Design a protein around this ligand. Structure first.
Ligand SMILES: CC(C)CCC[C@@H](C)[C@H]1CC[C@H]2[C@@H]3CC=C4C[C@@H](O)CC[C@]4(C)[C@H]3CC[C@]12C
Ligand SMILES: Nc1ncnc2c1ncn2[C@@H]1O[C@H](COP(=O)(O)OP(=O)(O)O)[C@@H](O)[C@H]1O
Lengths: 329, 126, 239, 297, 43
């Protein structure tokens, strides 16, 4: 308990001010009224996952009907429709190269599909196994190395070509429900269902900083564009922006009308807007500097289960349990 | 940091009174449904009692339904389980389990001990 | 922009082919019914799944079965390859037709845990609209235990002493009064949780079964018929 | 020799009042229904398509009503427009029977969704409902097309301008044949269809008893009251329409004038009953369903 | 816990200033923050 007390004392000492008070001089973003430019419909069942390609145009949406649909967001044309061996898929990804798309879920197996194949179709390029729990978030590092967050309280780092668990990250007391990568792709922050988000070094394989302050299960993590901070959404309906430099909580986003936990979060390319999908069927965009609810993205008949901001910052994709994925700009 | 350190316990004669308390800190505690769980020596882990956010809708395991009155003080930020009667079968390690989702009527705590929103536990013997 | 027009035409043709495949998949997916097979880990689940298979394959932990009754295809899945915390993977099963809840009613020690799990399933935010097919198993074991009388349910459930057999009970062949009283007491204990909330969104179907019972398929078929009949009645605005 | 229509109050005052009440109720009810179906409903299904089309037909009927209200309240004198009469008696009818057809489609769809819940799940699509709705609208427009020619406008002996809903005395026999055919095809066959489908629905809801699911009593009550409303509002109206056509063809003499007057007066009353559907069907089909009320914001 | 505690924990004021500077520098490059014209917006 001495180490925990010392860490708390250091965090309190470093807590010399509040982010809201410092940013009060900065003018607020006002009211944000993003509209649905495109509605990407065609999913049979609820959409559990979302990711944008590095080209900032293509989209991958995973649905518990066992469907990995690669949409062209510009034209609302399903470029690909990969059927999955396991119907219940909770994670999806784009490789940075774009030639591979990952999926996973209750099958405990991360399936990597080769999109750009010489045959002229989509096939299971790899089937990584070794996790003892459901996969909640798997994302590529360099298109030949994938970090997967599972429900066995441990994260894994696999070499796709080798197909073996090269690195294992342990220390979470609960199921990991989110996983985000720094823009430098050297450290990644994984949040478990224990109100704890741990930052792991990819090469070292051990946690460097554990962040607490949440009250319930963490369901979503996104990185700040600068890579020195990360926002976590949890079941206590409150987002928390932690700063790596301060090694403690920096900002809290909450309200009185919110009584439902966050499902997916996604920062804006500038970091001024923190987007967060909620269980109340509506997404919310917050001013990360001012902690004020900048705006609401309604329009989903069910809860917003996945939320992704494109690399170009031009649009957002909100996929809900109503088998609908909407594009906002 | 979520903490649920338990106080009260130790050896007690059968039929005695041994009130247990939890110092629930790190969350609002005014909305989370709370539970008392017990682990017998070398025998699994069984839920004992439940109590809603407002203190009503209290329920107990039938084995201790008559005794073991549960109570919750939001202002004091604490929760207590008064054991009116004690039996040798009640000798176990008692933990306080917080419901995971705050404003929900369901509790999905863990059977084989891995739950995080749970105290270290206090051992009571008869 | 001839090349751009050709690329757009090829994109539209591929999208049309994918949409036709998706329409076929939608027909097949709506035609098939998903049944989340839940229950305490003590007993009931795997034996039922295997028996339904003998009437369809699990590799990484999820024991799936794609049995068909009459002309309707059912998908029952026993998700067993998961560590401890049903809270997070239960969310996914909010699109299933029903949750087949297998309760080992012969073991009174774990009956309270099964009741708590049933209450959590019933009161879960995402399982409000998902009906539960109660499938109290090992009725032969429960009858043998009651007839032997080694352990009394009054020790585990004091309210059983004041409980009396309901007038609407339908005893089986033989049906010793103690056995019938115990079985219907467990059924009423689960149905109290079932009726405590739901306001007509979903209903619990309390079927008693055994390990070697061959009527389980018909029970699930009729329960799914009633579930989708009520779903249509809500959809058709017939209350 | 022609009857003087002593009991004209059933048309000069009763019908305008009934049509005014029907306008007031049905306009709001059907506007709310279509607004819910368009801007605040689920991703829609076949029954939603049928119910939206029925609500649209009732709303267009209600919108056609005020012209007839002005015509009736002006002592059966036209409200100007001449050929617009041919429009009104068209649109009115093509909505009235339209509802009588869409109430059939719903009654068919429910029969699929209740009697055979499992079987009629993969063999059912929203596109099929859209195709059936388009076919029903086309059949309505084609069958009520002769109304555009028959429903002319004439000048009575009392210097009044009458917008003949049925026809003038010249084409009375041909219009009687046409109206008998329209009643048989667009009302009598739909009436048999809805009666049989709901009877089967009641049989499935009662005798099967849903094994264990309670609260089917309110569904049975809704089905029964829908059946009774449809019957008591449309059967007398279509009976009295043919009766009035036959009475205008036959009789027309002081010896049998009074009976004709009777089948006149009752006819007017029955006509009001028909308008009442465009108020009761939106209430029973939409406002009496728990799902619609929950989705009502 | 020892490794996590032993770190160059900077003051939260410095972190907030750095985050504000990063948001202000990249403010123009965010179409969500400032709505780009429909001609520039591909959607
Ligand atoms: C949300 C979408 C799917 C609703 C679709 C409703 C469509 C199928 C319905 C609503 C209104 C209907 C139209 C109403 C009026 C007419 C004019 C008539 O001379 C031909 C039929 C036609 C053209 C109908 C065709 C079917 C129609 C267009
Ligand atoms: N049985 C009848 N005998 C004499 N006149 C009638 C009879 N029925 C209707 N009329 C008159 O003929 C005119 C046209 O009636 P009809 O075409 O049936 O529809 P509407 O009454 O709506 O115009 C009306 O003004 C009505 O007063």
């Amino acid at each position: 308990e001495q180490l925990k007390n010392q860490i708390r004392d250091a965090r309190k000492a470093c807590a010399d001010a509040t982010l809201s008070q410092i940013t009060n001089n900065i003018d607020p973003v006002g009211r944000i009224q993003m509209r649905t430019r495109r509605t990407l419909r065609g999913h049979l069942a609820k959409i559990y996952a979302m990711h944008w390609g590095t080209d900032s145009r293509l989209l991958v949406s995973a649905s518990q009907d066992g469907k990995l649909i690669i949409w062209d967001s510009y034209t609302t044309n399903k470029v690909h429709a990969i059927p999955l061996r396991s119907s219940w898929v909770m994670t999806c990804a784009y490789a940075p190269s774009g030639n591979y798309v990952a999926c996973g879920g209750l099958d405990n197996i991360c399936s990597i599909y080769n999109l750009k194949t010489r045959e002229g179709n989509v096939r299971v390029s790899r089937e990584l196994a070794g996790h003892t729990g459901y996969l909640s978030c798997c994302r590529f590092l360099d298109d030949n190395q994938i970090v997967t967050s599972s429900g066995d309280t441990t994260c894994a780092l696999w070499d796709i070509e080798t197909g073996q668990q090269t690195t294992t990250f342990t220390g979470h007391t609960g199921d990991v429900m989110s996983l985000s990568l720094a823009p430098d792709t050297r450290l990644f922050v994984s949040g478990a269902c224990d109100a704890s988000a741990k930052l792991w070094d990819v090469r070292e394989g051990m946690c460097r900083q554990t962040f607490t302050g949440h009250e319930s299960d963490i369901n979503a993590i996104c990185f700040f564009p600068n890579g020195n901070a990360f926002a976590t959404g949890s079941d206590d309906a409150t987002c928390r922006l932690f700063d790596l430099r301060a090694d403690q909580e920096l900002m809290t986003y909450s309200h009185d009308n919110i009584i439902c936990g966050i499902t997916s979060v996604s920062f804006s390319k500038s970091g001024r807007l923190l987007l967060a999908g909620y269980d109340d069927f509506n997404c919310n965009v917050w001013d990360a500097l001012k902690a004020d609810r900048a705006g609401v993205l309604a329009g989903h008949d069910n809860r917003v289960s996945c939320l992704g901001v494109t690399d170009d910052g031009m649009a957002v994709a909100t996929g809900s349990w109503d088998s609908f994925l909407k594009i906002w700009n | 940091q979520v903490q649920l350190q338990e106080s009260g316990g130790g050896l007690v004669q059968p039929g005695g009174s041994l009130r247990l308390s939890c110092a629930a800190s790190g969350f609002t505690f005014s909305n989370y449904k709370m539970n008392w769980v017990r682990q017998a020596p070398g025998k699994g882990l069984e839920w004992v009692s439940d109590i809603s956010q407002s203190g009503a809708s209290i329920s107990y395991t039938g084995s201790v339904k008559g005794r073991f009155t549960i109570s919750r003080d939001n202002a004091k930020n604490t929760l207590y389980l008064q054991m009116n009667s004690l039996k040798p079968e009640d000798t176990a390690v008692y933990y306080c389990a917080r419901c995971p989702a705050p404003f929900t009527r369901d509790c999905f705590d863990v059977t084989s001990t891995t739950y995080a929103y749970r105290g270290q536990g206090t051992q009571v013997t008869v | 922009t001839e090349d751009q027009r050709n690329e757009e035409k090829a994109q539209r043709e591929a999208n049309k082919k994918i949409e036709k495949q998706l329409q076929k998949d939608k027909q097949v997916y709506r035609a098939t019914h998903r049944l989340l097979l839940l229950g305490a880990d003590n007993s009931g689940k795997s034996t039922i799944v295997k028996q339904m298979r003998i009437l369809s394959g699990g590799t990484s932990g999820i024991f799936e079965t794609k049995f068909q009754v009459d002309k309707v295809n059912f998908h029952m899945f026993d998700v067993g390859g998961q560590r401890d915390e049903r809270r997070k993977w239960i969310q996914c099963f909010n699109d299933v037709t029903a949750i087949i809840f297998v309760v080992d009613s012969s073991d009174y020690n774990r009956l309270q845990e099964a009741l708590n799990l049933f209450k959590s399933i019933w009161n879960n935010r995402w399982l409000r609209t998902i009906s539960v097919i109660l499938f109290l198993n090992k009725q032969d074991l429960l009858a043998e235990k009651v007839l032997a009388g080694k352990s009394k349910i009054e020790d585990y459930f004091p309210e059983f002493a004041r409980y009396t057999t309901p007038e609407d009970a339908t005893p089986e062949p033989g049906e010793d009064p103690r056995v019938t009283r115990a079985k219907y007491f467990i059924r009423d204990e689960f149905l109290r949780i079932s009726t405590a909330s739901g306001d007509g969104r979903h209903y619990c179907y309390p079927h008693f079964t055994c390990a070697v019972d061959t009527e389980n398929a018909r029970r699930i078929f009729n329960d799914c018929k009633d579930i989708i009949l009520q779903m249509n009645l809500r959809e058709y605005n017939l209350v | 020799f022609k009857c003087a229509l002593t009991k004209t109050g059933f048309q000069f005052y009763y019908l305008p009042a009934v049509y005014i009440l029907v306008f007031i109720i049905g306009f709001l009810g059907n506007s709310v229904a279509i607004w819910m179906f368009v801007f605040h409903m689920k991703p829609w299904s076949g029954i939603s398509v049928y119910m939206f089309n029925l609500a649209l037909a009732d709303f267009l009927y209600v919108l056609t009503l005020p012209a007839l209200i002005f015509y009736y309240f002006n002592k059966t004198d036209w409200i100007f427009g001449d050929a617009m009469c041919k429009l009104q008696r068209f649109i009115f009818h093509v909505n009235l029977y339209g509802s009588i057809l869409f109430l059939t489609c719903i009654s068919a769809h429910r029969y699929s969704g209740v009697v055979y819940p499992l079987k009629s799940l993969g063999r059912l699509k929203k596109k099929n409902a859209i195709c059936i709705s388009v076919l029903v609208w086309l059949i309505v427009v084609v069958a009520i097309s002769p109304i555009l020619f028959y429903s002319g406008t004439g000048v009575r002996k009392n210097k009044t301008i009458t917008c003949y809903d049925t026809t003038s005395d010249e084409y009375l026999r041909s219009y009687f044949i046409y109206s008998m055919c329209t009643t048989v095809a667009m009302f009598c066959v739909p009436l048999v269809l809805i009666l049989g489908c709901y009877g089967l629905i009641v049989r499935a809801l009662i005798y099967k008893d849903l094994d264990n699911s309670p609260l089917r009593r309110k569904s049975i009550y809704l089905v029964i009251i829908v059946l009774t409303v449809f019957a008591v509002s449309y059967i007398p109206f279509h009976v009295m329409k043919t009766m009035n056509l036959r009475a205008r063809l036959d009789f027309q003499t002081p010896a049998m004038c009074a009976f004709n007057d009777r089948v006149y007066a009752t006819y007017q009353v029955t006509r009001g009953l028909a308008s009442l559907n465009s108020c009761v069907d939106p209430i029973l089909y939409f406002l009496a369903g728990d799902t619609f009320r929950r989705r009502l914001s | 816990l020892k490794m996590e505690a032993n770190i160059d924990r900077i003051k939260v004021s410095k972190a907030a200033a750095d985050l504000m500077a990063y948001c202000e520098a990249h403010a123009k490059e965010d179409p969500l923050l400032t709505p780009v014209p429909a001609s520039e917006n591909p959607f």
